[model samples]
Each structure stands twice: as structure tokens, then as C-alpha cells.
Target: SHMCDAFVGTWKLVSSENFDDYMKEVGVGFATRKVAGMAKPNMIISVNGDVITIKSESTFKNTEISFILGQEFDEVTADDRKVKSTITLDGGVLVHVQKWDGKSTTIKRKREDDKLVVECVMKGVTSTRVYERA
Candidate 1:
């Protein structure tokens, strides 16, 4: 299916929803939320044969994370939480789960037709961010 190749490019933000609630749910302060909520993020996804890299840049901040699928790694996410994370692929859907301080968060990303859909859930709050191929 060429799932890895399907995600190997820069994607521009098309739309983002519920990001404020998700940020707040993850304990981001109002100031940071205001900046992140307003800034448009450009995401770049790349697969190096066996490794995966996801990077995003915004007017407020730029961050990158990389890991081998299915391997547990320590990461401090952009939302500012230090956790252990593991990523796996299911039917072309890239899925990652994070554990931090007794709380868990999950994010799933998939390509539907021409759009890339990324959904994140934490503490019952959900955020959906969509991107278009660039």
C-alpha cells in the first residue's frame, strides 16, 4: 500500500478544530493556548525506510519528534508533557499512545483520499486537525 511513502512529504494545514480544548485539557496556560490556537502549523512527515519522523512548525513554536515504530521512547511532547510513547501502524493508520503521570493520550493519523486526518484525544477531549498535500 506504500503507507510509508504516502506520508513522506510536507503537508500544509487546512483546518483545525477543538485545538483550544485539547490544549487546555493538556494543561496549557491561556497565553500559550492563545498563541498555539492562532498559529497555523505546517507538518512534515517522513519515513526513512524503517524509521518515522514527524515535525511541525508554527509561528509560535517548531518541534520535531522521531522514533522507530513499535519501540518505546521517552519524549517530551510539544504540548509540554514528558511521557513514554510508542507508535504503531494499523491498516495504514499511524497510531501513537503516550503515558504520562498516570494519564494517557492517543493520537491517530490516516490519509483519506487526498487529505490527511489527525485526531488526538486526552482526558475525553478530542481535537481533529486536517492537512492537505503540499
Candidate 2:
């Protein structure tokens, strides 16, 4: 089993596929989506006990969010939008509960066949983005 310690580190987005569509569904405009698609995102994860802090840094935007494992709380996004979120472990996969704009958002991450698979569900839309380790 992968422990929280296994996830506490910096992960760079070496390559991403199909993230453009995901961004588009998230209300990102065409220009913004193009820029995000070309930019590399660096993810920094820190774990303290049951709390996990994640920072996604990119040239386009920098976002930092935190949550407790298996515990739900109100989370404010970088855009100042409020959401209820929780971080949980589904086996080795990292799961996130995201609630925003009266909608439920679910984000799941797992390592699959030498690649990282990230699935996001929100607003009646499900988007999947794949990333390879740097």
C-alpha cells in the first residue's frame, strides 16, 4: 500500500494529454486553455498527519489547497470560490471531494502503468487527464 509519505514531494508535469478538454469544461476559455496546455505544471504536496496541502504552480496560475484525509471541510479556491473538500485514499489512489457552485466535484488520482491518471467529475461533466512522471 502507498502511504501518505509516498505522496509528499514535488511532482512535475512532464507531459499531459487530454487536459485541454478538461480545462475547457472547467470554464477555461480558448486562449487560456491553449496557454495551459502548453505550460508545465508543478505540483507540490505536503502531508502533516491527516492533513494534506497541495500547491499547483504554473505560469498561468498558482493554486494552493489543503484538506484533511477522510474529513470534509469548506475550502476556498484560488478564485475565492468556496467548496467542501476532503482528501481520502482509495487504495493507492488519491481522492478529493470538491464542492463548488452548488455542484459536487470529485477528483481522483492513481498511478496506472507508468503514468498518472487523474479523473475529475463536476457539473455533469467527467474529464480525464493523464500525466507522465518527470
Candidate 3:
């Protein structure tokens, strides 16, 4: 298992498979635990001529990061961790690659067959947070 995910509020959530991932990486009192006090993952994104900035609309704390494609920069994650962030486009898919710890995770957001698929992979521990809007 090469990773974890922590937007993780009203999120890491409802009992199921691999929820263990969160249980394994996160504790009972991490940043915020109780759903009533969990963080709200609000993402307001902006880009100016290839320069992109993504900010989280969180209650506990707000975080922001900016990046320019084909270039590398230090960026913070939604969960408030420091990592080297990079972005790239391939075959029409937008990929956000973050390197931290001993492994790197690639978060891919793309549309597949009318489905909005958001996936993350760490050390090849991959899972797609799939959703569809009618």
C-alpha cells in the first residue's frame, strides 16, 4: 500500500473496504476527526496563462498552492502537508503528481465514459474515487 488520502472529512467515512487505509494512516485526533468538526474541502481553482493556483476552503485552516506546468515547485496538499507538486496533461487527462515521504502519488482527474473519475496512487496503491453527476 503506497499511500493515503485526507480530504477526509464527512469523508474517510462510512465503513467499507480499504477504509482501513485511512484508519491505518490517520489516528482518532488527526487535525480534525469528528465529522461534526471535520474540515470542509472547498477548492477554488484559478489559472492565469498556464499558472495555476488551488486553494482549499477549509474551516480548521485554509491552504493555498500555485504551480506552472512543465515546471516544478513546492506545494502543500489539502490535508496540510508539504510536498513537491507538479502537473501535466496526457491524452486529455489532467494529472497532478506529488512527491513526499519515500514515494510519490499521482492524482488523476478525468472523465471516462461519462463518469468523473478522481484517482490517487501511492507506491502503486491506487484507488479511484469515482462519481457521476446527472
Candidate 4:
């Protein structure tokens, strides 16, 4: 099967499921998380050669990172936290690894129907976040 090159661009958040709960689990404060959870976010993705750059933009914060397919590199989150990461395609799933503060995380993304399902596991915490094409 062929992958969509269209997936290689920017995407703005239209809606999120369980966003409040997800933010809460991330240790975000009730008031702040409420605002953050409600704010619309924009996601930008740029693919150059074998590298992919993803930017998540919002009024509260913006996070961006770049990684090459199958190659490991340092990663930083929206909060300026650092991690080690790599991304690759396994079968139809997009896989990502993030290592931070001696801990590590892995995320898997795949398209189902019109939604992009993202499953993330890290620090003994597992959650699924979904995004629809907009």
C-alpha cells in the first residue's frame, strides 16, 4: 500500500477526545489544563529527505521537534524538556521513541477510517489520542 504524501504537512487541531484527562495525567494544573485543553492547537509537519519535523502550536505553548527515519536524535518537548527520539515506519504504523531523564517513551500512529490514532506509552503511563484530518 502507498502512503499519503499529504500526511507530510501541517494540521490544526479541530477537536480532541479525553484531552482534559490526558492533560491532567501529565500533571497539568486544573485551571491551566482546562485552558490548555480548550485551546485549539495547530500541528505542522515537514518532511525533508528522511527527516520529519513536527510542530504543535497553541496559544499557551508551542512544541516542535525533528527526527530522521530510523535514526536517533535529541528531542525536546513544548515545555523545553529534553529527550532522545527516533521515528520510523513499521508496516503502516508510524513509530516514535522518546527518551527523557533516563526514562523512555514509544508512540505508534496509524490511520483508521478518517481518524489518526496515536497510542503513547511512557513512564508507566499509557494513553491514546486521536486526530482527524482537517
Question: Each candidate's lDDT (Cα)?
Answer: 0.88, 0.72, 0.53, 0.69
What's the TM for model 1?
Answer: 0.92
Residues 1-134 of candidate 2 have per-residue lDDT tens digits of: 33666566677776555566666666667876677677677778887766688888888779887777788888765445577888889888899977766666678978777666678776666777666654
Clash number for every model? 0, 0, 1, 0
Clashing residue pairs found in predicted model 4: none
The residue ranges of model 4 lying beyond 4 angstroms of the native Cα positions read: 1-6, 14-35
Candidate 1 structure quality by residue, lDDT tens digits, 3-54: 5778789998889999899888878899888988888788899887677899
Tens-digit per-residue lDDT, 49-74, candidate 4: 66677787889888887776788888
Worst 10 residues of 4 by lDDT: 1-10
Candidate numbers sorted by TM-score from highest down: 1, 2, 4, 3
Per-residue lDDT of candidate 3, residues 3-83 (tens digit): 111111121211122322442242224434444234434544556666666565556666777777668888765455578
Instruction: For each candidate in turn, give its C-alpha RMSD to the true structure in angstroms.
Output: 1.4, 2.8, 8.2, 3.0
Misplaced by over 4 Å in model 2 are 78-81, 113-115, 123-126, 131-134
Please provide the root mean square deviation of candidate 1 (C-alpha atoms, Å). Answer: 1.4
Model 3 regions lying over 4 Å from their true place? 1-40, 112-116, 130-134
Residue range with the least summed lDDT across 10 consecutive positions in model 3? 1-10
Candidate 3 has an lDDT of 0.53
